[PDB]
Enzyme design. Structure first.
Site, PDB file in Angstrom:
ATOM      1  N   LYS B  23      -2.097 -14.111 -15.811  1.00  0.00           N
ATOM      2  CA  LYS B  23      -1.840 -15.229 -14.784  1.00  0.00           C
ATOM      3  C   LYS B  23      -2.194 -14.514 -13.595  1.00  0.00           C
ATOM      4  O   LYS B  23      -2.949 -15.069 -12.537  1.00  0.00           O
ATOM      5  CB  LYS B  23      -0.583 -15.913 -14.927  1.00  0.00           C
ATOM      6  CG  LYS B  23      -0.661 -17.178 -14.124  1.00  0.00           C
ATOM      7  CD  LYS B  23       0.193 -16.517 -12.747  1.00  0.00           C
ATOM      8  CE  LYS B  23       1.710 -16.117 -13.265  1.00  0.00           C
ATOM      9  NZ  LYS B  23       2.364 -15.778 -11.921  1.00  0.00           N
ATOM     10  N   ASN B  24      -1.601 -13.335 -13.329  1.00  0.00           N
ATOM     11  CA  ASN B  24      -1.547 -12.663 -12.019  1.00  0.00           C
ATOM     12  C   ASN B  24      -2.979 -11.810 -11.606  1.00  0.00           C
ATOM     13  O   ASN B  24      -3.194 -11.253 -10.699  1.00  0.00           O
ATOM     14  CB  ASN B  24      -0.449 -11.512 -11.856  1.00  0.00           C
ATOM     15  CG  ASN B  24       0.884 -12.455 -11.782  1.00  0.00           C
ATOM     16  OD1 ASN B  24       0.788 -13.559 -11.285  1.00  0.00           O
ATOM     17  ND2 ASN B  24       1.881 -12.132 -12.324  1.00  0.00           N
ATOM     18  N   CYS B 120      10.270 -19.603  -0.709  1.00  0.00           N
ATOM     19  CA  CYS B 120      10.089 -19.428  -2.285  1.00  0.00           C
ATOM     20  C   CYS B 120      11.495 -19.148  -2.632  1.00  0.00           C
ATOM     21  O   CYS B 120      12.613 -18.444  -1.890  1.00  0.00           O
ATOM     22  CB  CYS B 120       9.314 -18.348  -2.772  1.00  0.00           C
ATOM     23  SG  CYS B 120       9.031 -18.122  -4.507  1.00  0.00           S
ATOM     24  N   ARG B 125       9.164 -14.346   1.233  1.00  0.00           N
ATOM     25  CA  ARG B 125       7.677 -13.713   1.131  1.00  0.00           C
ATOM     26  C   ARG B 125       6.800 -13.981   2.234  1.00  0.00           C
ATOM     27  O   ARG B 125       6.301 -14.928   2.312  1.00  0.00           O
ATOM     28  CB  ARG B 125       7.307 -14.392  -0.389  1.00  0.00           C
ATOM     29  CG  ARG B 125       8.103 -14.308  -1.446  1.00  0.00           C
ATOM     30  CD  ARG B 125       7.805 -14.760  -2.552  1.00  0.00           C
ATOM     31  NE  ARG B 125       6.446 -14.275  -3.363  1.00  0.00           N
ATOM     32  CZ  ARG B 125       6.026 -14.815  -4.459  1.00  0.00           C
ATOM     33  NH1 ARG B 125       6.795 -15.812  -5.232  1.00  0.00           N
ATOM     34  NH2 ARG B 125       4.918 -14.204  -4.907  1.00  0.00           N
ATOM     35  N   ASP B 309       8.249  -8.209 -12.361  1.00  0.00           N
ATOM     36  CA  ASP B 309       8.012  -9.449 -13.380  1.00  0.00           C
ATOM     37  C   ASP B 309       8.711  -9.243 -14.545  1.00  0.00           C
ATOM     38  O   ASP B 309       8.646 -10.548 -15.350  1.00  0.00           O
ATOM     39  CB  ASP B 309       6.621  -9.802 -13.223  1.00  0.00           C
ATOM     40  CG  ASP B 309       6.089 -10.267 -11.862  1.00  0.00           C
ATOM     41  OD1 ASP B 309       6.927 -10.584 -10.970  1.00  0.00           O
ATOM     42  OD2 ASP B 309       4.879 -10.527 -11.703  1.00  0.00           O
ATOM     43  N   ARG B 401       4.148 -22.311 -15.899  1.00  0.00           N
ATOM     44  CA  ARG B 401       3.062 -21.945 -14.915  1.00  0.00           C
ATOM     45  C   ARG B 401       2.408 -20.253 -15.446  1.00  0.00           C
ATOM     46  O   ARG B 401       1.766 -19.903 -14.895  1.00  0.00           O
ATOM     47  CB  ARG B 401       3.922 -21.504 -13.612  1.00  0.00           C
ATOM     48  CG  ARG B 401       4.450 -22.598 -12.787  1.00  0.00           C
ATOM     49  CD  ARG B 401       4.859 -22.461 -11.434  1.00  0.00           C
ATOM     50  NE  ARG B 401       4.095 -21.788 -10.527  1.00  0.00           N
ATOM     51  CZ  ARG B 401       4.479 -21.517  -9.216  1.00  0.00           C
ATOM     52  NH1 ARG B 401       5.613 -21.693  -8.809  1.00  0.00           N
ATOM     53  NH2 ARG B 401       3.497 -20.848  -8.450  1.00  0.00           N
TER      54      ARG B 401
HETATM   55  C1  LIG Z   1       8.059 -19.475  -5.162  1.00  0.00           C
HETATM   56  C2  LIG Z   1       8.317 -19.132  -6.649  1.00  0.00           C
HETATM   57  O1  LIG Z   1       6.722 -19.558  -4.799  1.00  0.00           O
HETATM   58  P1  LIG Z   1       5.705 -20.446  -5.421  1.00  0.00           P
HETATM   59  O2  LIG Z   1       6.354 -21.398  -6.464  1.00  0.00           O
HETATM   60  O3  LIG Z   1       4.521 -19.759  -6.555  1.00  0.00           O
HETATM   61  O4  LIG Z   1       4.717 -21.076  -4.426  1.00  0.00           O
HETATM   62  C3  LIG Z   1       8.436 -20.965  -4.765  1.00  0.00           C
HETATM   63  O5  LIG Z   1       7.982 -21.565  -4.060  1.00  0.00           O
HETATM   64  O6  LIG Z   1       9.784 -21.276  -5.320  1.00  0.00           O
END
Ligand SMILES: *[C@](C)(OP(=O)(O)O)C(=O)O
Ligand SMILES: *[C@](C)(OP(=O)(O)O)C(=O)O
Ligand SMILES: [Cl-]
Ligand SMILES: [Cl-]
Lengths: 421, 421
Positions: B23-24, B120, B125, B309, B401
């Protein structure tokens, strides 16, 4: 669901605002009603909040009769029947504070079954201070399929030194102690105004609680408590939120019947910043000249230090002051999520562990933002008042846990704000 | 909504498991398709995940034609038309990783409009490393009503020293550099296997990228890139998740076609703990004797250090080892939320800042728990395999996801697990 829409700029707030009863006092006061085996308890000045409806379901589930007259802001509880022992997952999972029925159930019933709380977004909130203190009082703790299973053959006093002055643990232990054998001493107790209001209620019910507000609470157990009538203390966090709103809009707002002594570390930091704060006969007036606001340092601490429940809102005010402000959040590990959403409004902030640095005067713009928690929601709405353009704030389920009619109160002070369904 | 139900205590996993494409890696590989002005790009070994459908909507919204053949695990992109500039809020708000189209849009189009990511749950981030690096390449950054507005009159190379080896910023800058004037050097670059796979794709498209996997990436800009066909690298986090599942159940599992070199710091820590890890012709076999598992210390770090991860899943394995394990999470600030839900299963852990201490061998019980994030969801399900009784895991939107058919793969290895609609 609903959205709050703010037309930014020119939102100088002027007028007077009424503040509800404290969310963080009414929840433990409702838990305390389980202690009264004779007479009914009536709480007045009860706020119409989602957390109050959940605690009324928890207490009603213990076989107490709970009637909420919303027009009268009144809750009547008849706990004179045979009280049952369980606080189920369906309520605790929706509201961690449900945990404060554990102490009163053990005092009244001698055994309890309370769902163990799980994760919380603003920080790790383990309940070991609650369980360690109850074990010292003769409670045997088991954990079975997600539930705390507690049994006290003969609940008794203990001399407890709190590793940290936990508000919830202090409330649980104070309430358990009221009907325990002998004397309980809680050292390094929480000193918050909500602890004081709970002790007032317990003493009005025939308990023997001394020292609330100080680092040491002493409880002398009695055989039984009686119902009483009690006004919930004003919500000092809603009051402080309107003080911050007045300050960051260069406004002139009378916060009706605000209690100076509950608002001390916030008021001192507003005065240091250059805000004017005047004690008047009808309430506390907050006025400011935007050009006089100067950056400050704040560190959240257990009461009487600066309250963590005012932190997010105060960081919104730090965005308009002159210079670089610093906010140190020591009570919760992860309570800067609003500053992440505020990046979408153009706010640059530097966050290193428990410390956020915010240069004031940046040129913010309205944007679509999402609430992550109760106080973050209020901080986003307040920032929307001063950003240029339109701010849309979503995930209002968080705001509705602690503010009643927030958009209506801001609109009556002159804010260009609407709640759209 | 959907729930995963696990009957625990006796779930020794035995058999072979197929792992999806990463996925990454697929998300930045899809962003890279915008660079190709001649020929179509075909990605194979594409996983069927919710994040892939969102990235296909982002790229399709730039006027590239995106066709996803799910049965063939294949995405075809025709970016030969006139590419547009906007990545809207409706996609970025649902998936932060959408941000990695910013670099390729600037390289191909010369201007971009990308919604600014907000908060997030697992940590702050901020994207300053992305924007600072793009400014050094001649991009003028503005921010308007929630959107990053970027314009490059003449995108050019830069000698960038990264303050931190950000995976997303490294991807954005290396893609922007492919069509910039001159040479770009990224010092302190991310070294993750996903960076290497993206560089392989760019070189297959006619770019000049050297050094991926090392702390220094050098890109020599070219006029245009061409479409190509590329297999997405195997998901090393899904592979590692099954290695941990085998270890904590005393199992014997062949992780098909696993890449030893991508799995190194995890494999070395499993070997130190007493797990057996064998490189075979068809994949990597993981076996363990539960009585041989010993506590260890782990610190998450940028690759080639232990991957963040894998952290949550590894803490689930620490619950069954003998002794006190320590997990230090240095990459994200709020990534221990699963340990708070695990207190509902009876797990005691001590969390101080970035460090969690976990005594192994505690007798855990199944309980109703809620996922907070992707890897936390996997960690709760793995803990359900070894707890006594029934575990019910909810909020599966997070699991979906990054894992395809997780419950089916565990059931075919012998786990008593069901996904109920
Ligand atoms: C973090 C997990 O980022 P994303 O969901 O990937 O946009 C969040 O928003 O909680
Ligand atoms: C925190 C806010 O606790 P609560 O919602 O009050 O149970 C959380 O669950 O995120
Ligand atoms: Cl439960
Ligand atoms: Cl290569």
């Amino acid at each position: 669901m609903d959205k709050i829409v703010v037309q930014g700029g020119d939102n100088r707030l002027v007028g007077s605002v009424t503040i509800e009863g404290a969310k963080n006092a009414v929840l433990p006061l409702l838990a305390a009603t389980i202690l009264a085996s004779e007479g009914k308890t009536v709480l007045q000045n009860v706020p119409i909040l989602s957390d109050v409806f959940i605690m009324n379901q928890v207490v009603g589930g213990l076989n107490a009769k709970v009637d909420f007259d919303e027009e009268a802001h009144l809750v009547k509880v008849d706990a004179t029947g045979d009280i049952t022992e369980e606080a189920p997952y369906k309520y605790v999972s929706k509201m961690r504070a449900s945990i404060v029925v554990l102490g009163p159930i053990l005092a009244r019933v001698g055994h309890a079954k309370v769902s163990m709380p799980g994760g919380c977004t603003i920080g790790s909130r383990p309940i070991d201070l609650h369980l360690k203190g109850l074990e010292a009082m003769g409670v045997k703790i088991s954990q079975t399929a997600g539930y705390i299973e507690a049994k006290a053959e003969r609940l008794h006093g203990a001399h407890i030194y709190m590793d940290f002055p936990s508000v919830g643990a202090t409330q649980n232990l104070m309430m358990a102690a009221t009907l325990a054998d002998g004397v309980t001493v809680i050292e390094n107790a929480a000193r918050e105004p909500e602890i004081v209001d709970l002790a007032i209620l317990l003493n009005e019910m025939g308990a023997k609680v001394k020292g609330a507000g100080t680092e040491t609470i002493t409880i002398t157990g009695v055989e039984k408590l009686h119902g009483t009538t009690h006004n919930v203390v004003q919500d000092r966090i809603e009051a402080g939120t309107f003080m911050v709103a007045a300050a960051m809009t260069g406004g002139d707002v009378l916060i009706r019947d605000a209690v100076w002594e509950h608002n001390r570390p916030l008021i001192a930091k507003l005065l240091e910043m250059g805000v004017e704060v005047i004690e008047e006969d009808e309430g506390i007036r907050v006025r400011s000249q935007l050009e006089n606001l100067k950056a400050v340092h704040v560190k959240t601490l257990p009461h009487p230090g600066f309250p963590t429940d005012m932190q997010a809102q105060f960081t919104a005010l730090m965005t308009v002051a002159k210079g670089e402000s610093t906010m140190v959040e020591t009570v919760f590990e992860n309570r800067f999520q609003h500053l992440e959403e505020m990046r979408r409004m153009g706010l640059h902030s530097e966050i290193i562990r428990d410390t956020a640095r915010i240069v004031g005067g940046q040129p913010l713009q309205g944007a679509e933002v999402l609430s992550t928690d109760l106080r973050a929601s209020a901080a986003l709405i307040l920032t929307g008042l001063v950003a240029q353009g339109e701010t849309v704030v979503g995930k209002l389920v968080h705001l509705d846990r602690g503010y009643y009619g927030f958009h209506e109160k801001l609109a009556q002070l002159g804010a260009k704000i609407q709640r759209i369904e």
